[PDB]
Ligand binder design. Structure first.
Ligand SMILES: Cc1ncc(C[n+]2c([C@@H](O)CCC(=O)O)sc(CCOP(=O)(O)OP(=O)(O)O)c2C)c(N)n1
Ligand SMILES: Cc1ncc(C[n+]2c([C@@H](O)CCC(=O)O)sc(CCOP(=O)(O)OP(=O)(O)O)c2C)c(N)n1
Ligand SMILES: [Mn+2]
Ligand SMILES: [Mn+2]
Lengths: 556, 556
């Protein structure tokens, strides 16, 4: 009889269904139209609830949680620009594969296109960026509950990767005490309510077959390229490449231990490239490669075949090589394509890699961001995880540091946005419960500045280094025009982050040399809280150091 | 021969074309892929250039400028999630009509869906929310410059209202010395380069015809409702309705002077609704009505005809009355349908309105947010403008205060997002050069907090009142469930804004009484800077005061 009651019974089915597909975390932003979803979610004991006031950060908080847990994560927002704010994290998820189930409340059809407040056209709003899109009908008992639960079971069950938009219209009244309205409608599901399985099980797997001619190809002069992958896959890939006796180019996102470090430097040396030309096959595991010299070498190399192995779908080779695009879990694939011990065929490149790291060590002392990146190993929290921000820092660490094999690295290198790094870091911390080191640039920190609110709640110490070089100094690294560079590229904002931390009652340090930095760290890892460490450095020193080291190493 | 040079010539045409349609302001965010657009913009002397690091904020900055200037405003961003961040302001613009010309840089087609960094599927990503969408082809001299300008001229020329999405792929190299590549390509346009007109003039006008039976209807018992409209229109409507002798329900956004103030209160009195039942016609001018009692009366009233006059298109009556929906400039519309001197027919509603206002006046003393709203008419900057935020503040001012006729009010009441209020306020100030009073709640300030960066640059004093009632207290007004209310609705963040202001070197005040507040105001209007005034009030006092006042006036 009661529209409010059935609304909540309708919503309760939606949320309960999600529990059958491993949704545990649910991220909620405030609103009224979302009431049926939010109350069913708050009443449901399967969920861990997170809240935030900024829906774009809420998006990234969900992204962070899914990134580390590898589980689908649900988000509830109200109708309007709240929905639109989810787009960036949704777009990121579409590239790197996190399962964001967006439950977006909506006005009913009778309140669309009539000037009603906070009513917009929401179905189809994210275009092709979600993997599945569900535009739910207006709630009515004339549609069976088994339909609703089947619709959701289809979307989640077949979800290989990426986000799901579930548009959820509710008509007022939204409030009022609960009736029996919708109860017998709900009871039509029988003991599904006490079950732990989906109502409809549809879960086909998408996987490439084993490559039958691998034993042929593993005999050739090959190269292994390791992009983004799990910490455990990084260790397996490193051992695999070593046994193959193939050189391993390890991205900072690979956690391979980068046995040939500073590839971004030695790859600029013609001797290394001359040697790499003897390669008949390149086997790349993972993607979203970081460094410019590697992306240039990828683009320029011409093996007989180029293979890319990864569990996300689609083309991943921006150079469009003749070859194979193999969809698989990287660890599973390695077992299906095992290595057999063979003599290494590379002689020059190991020597160049050693000299390159040596050249960087010669310059380790200056109190700069390049040097910070270089030493970032000395500061990783024990049994923790690293979140690398975008722009220069990931590039500097990629080129200058040799990160430990199997030490977990996380990032937003799908679209490489600087818009959700603090809140994403917060979700990355909360999902694993591990001590976390996060490093971002100053424009990035400002962009998601209000996520400092989220970092007031962490389950383990989280150190946030904000590298302040007064602008987006990547545009000092790029050959930008000097006359327009500052105003239209760098965009220095001339701030510090002391008041930013103080506002949110977060410990803050502004270390002026290495001893103070080490002191700040020792202080920061002591408690389950976020410490902001602001490192003030000169604008272009980082960019100039990288360039100089590139030139030096090119002449070895 | 030179791709980078022609890239910049291609862009030069795009930006020059815009100048022919009154685009003066252009809002720019940093990027490399946007370089061709951004250098073309920086080289063009017709533009006023604004910069920001938060692309969502950038959108709202442009929205604010467009809101006041009534001209199209251009936005340039780089590819990726930068584009997605524009969606909130694009959607709002889509509802209330600002002409935002979005120049969104893109990777070329060959770097899409192949795992390239910061490359996403961008054409159509804003779905149906732009009024026009131009997905430009890959730049090439094989397409004449006259096609390119004609496409833009059509888009801008036929633009009645709302945003235009112009997706602009550019291939690298993006940098390099300027060549003569594309010059003769440009020179095919002849002396159009020295003209001040579009290449193709296409500007058909969209307008309703004179209502031929208006002489009949202006003699009936009518009611005038004033929604959002320009400041000059508010004064004309006030005069028009007074002359007709029809009661004027004036919304806070109307600038009519609200001759029957506190409608949100007396519309709750059964004697008023009975009187209003005698109405044979309702003529509403403008839209997006604020108050709940007015929205409920609109829903329940049943005149023979219901008219809505407004220059934006589509249905604007969420109650779907039998009647007429007339598209016209409101001031023009009034001259086409002049008033006749007629005796006022309402007797009861004037009595109730005065009693309602007295009832509010009695409670003016407490230092609460309701009393601030009530008293705000007394604190408006001379020759200034008011930017009113969303949630409680726009509602309390609508219900409890009487704003002066023709005194400019600006807001975001299309979708009523709380996500861009500060950056919009900056654009509103910068657009008019007038002293500005902006009022927002605490979550609203947190949401667009980094927009404080923009408020360091204003051409006249801007007072930002931040009302801090510790959370989204509109949800104390709504009958939300109390057990879940705090965690899932209110979301108190327990913060103050002294450090935020300190971060951007903005003067700050936290007045504890009316004397200190007036002291704070007087100091603030003295320099062309932004002063932050934080009013800390008890969480639910504002909401309950309104409910109590509603109760009292309803029993007269
Ligand atoms: C939402 C959005 N909007 C704009 C951009 C463009 N964008 C970049 C891409 O070039 C990132 C390349 C990459 O990492 O792949 S880097 C950058 C400035 C970063 O400034 P910072 O934090 O102070 O760091 P710093 O440069 O080390 O000094 C911008 C503004 C974006 N990515 N996302
Ligand atoms: C981007 C986005 N996301 C969420 C919402 C939902 N939403 C609202 C809609 O009800 C606005 C209704 C209206 O104005 O008509 S109001 C509100 C909380 C405001 O808290 P505050 O700033 O501290 O001020 P106070 O409530 O006076 O205490 C929210 C969170 C939104 N509108 N936009
Ligand atoms: Mn920086
Ligand atoms: Mn509040």
């Amino acid at each position: 009889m009661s529209v409010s009651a059935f609304n909540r019974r309708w919503a309760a089915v939606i949320l309960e269904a999600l529990t059958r597909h491993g949704v545990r975390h649910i991220c909620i932003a405030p609103g009224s139209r979302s009431t049926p979803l939010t109350l069913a979610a708050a009443e449901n004991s399967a969920f861990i609830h997170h809240t935030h006031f900024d829906e774009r950060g809420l998006g990234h908080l969900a992204l962070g949680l899914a990134k580390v847990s590898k589980q689908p994560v649900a988000v509830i927002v109200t109708s309007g620009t709240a929905v639109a704010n989810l787009y960036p994290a949704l777009i990121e998820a579409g590239l790197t594969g996190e399962k964001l189930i967006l439950l977006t409340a909506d006005r009913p059809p009778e309140l669309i296109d009539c000037g009603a407040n906070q009513a917009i056209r929401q179905p189809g709003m994210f275009a092709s960026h979600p993997t599945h899109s569900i535009s739910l009908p207006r709630p009515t008992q004339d549609i069976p509950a088994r339909w609703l639960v089947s619709t959701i079971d289809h979307a989640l069950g077949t979800l290989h990767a990426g986000g799901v938009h579930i548009n959820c219209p509710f008509a007022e009244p939204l409030y009022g005490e609960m009736d029996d309205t919708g109860l017998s409608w709900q009871q039509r599901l029988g003991d599904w309510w006490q079950d732990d399985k989906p109502w409809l099980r549809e879960a086909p797997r998408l996987e490439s077959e084993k490559q039958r001619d691998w034993f042929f190809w593993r005999q050739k002069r090959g190269v292994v390229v390791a992009g983004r992958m799990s910490a455990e896959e990084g260790k397996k890939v490193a051992l695999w490449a070593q046994t193959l006796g193939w050189p391993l180019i390890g991205d900072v996102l690979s956690q391979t231990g980068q046995p040939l470090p500073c590839a971004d430097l030695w790859l600029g040396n013609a001797k290394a490239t001359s040697e790499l030309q003897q390669a008949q096959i390149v086997v790349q595991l993972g993607s979203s490669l970081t460094g410019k010299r590697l992306l240039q070498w990828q683009a320029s190399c011409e093996p007989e075949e180029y293979w890319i192995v990864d569990d996300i779908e689609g083309r991943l080779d921006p150079a469009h090589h003749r070859g194979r695009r193999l969809i698989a879990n990287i660890a599973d694939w390695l077992e299906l394509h095992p290595a057999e011990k063979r003599q290494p065929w590379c002689v020059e490149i190991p020597r160049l890699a050693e000299q390159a790291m040596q050249a960087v060590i010669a310059r380790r002392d200056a109190f700069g961001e390049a040097q910070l990146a270089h030493r970032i190993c000395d500061y990783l929290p024990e049994q923790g995880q690293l979140f690398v921000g975008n722009s220069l820092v990931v590039r500097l660490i990629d080129a200058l540091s040799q990160l430990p094999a199997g030490y977990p690295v996380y990032s937003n290198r799908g679209a490489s946005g600087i818009d959700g790094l603090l809140s994403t870091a917060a979700g990355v911390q909360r999902a694993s419960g591990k001590p976390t080191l996060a490093i971002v640039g100053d424009l990035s920190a400002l962009y998601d500045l209000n996520a400092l609110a989220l970092l007031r709640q962490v389950s383990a110490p989280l150190v946030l280094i904000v590298v302040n070089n007064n602008g987006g100094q990547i545009f000092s690294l790029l050959p930008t025009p000097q006359s327009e560079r500052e105003r239209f590229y760098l965009m220095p904002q001339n701030v510090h982050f002391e008041h930013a931390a103080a506002m949110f009652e977060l410990k803050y340090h502004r270390p002026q040399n290495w001893q103070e930095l080490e002191t700040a760290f020792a202080d920061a890892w002591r408690t389950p809280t976020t410490t902001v460490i602001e490192m003030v450095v000169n604008d272009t020193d980082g960019a100039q150091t990288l360039q100089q080291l590139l030139a030096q190493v090119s002449h070895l």
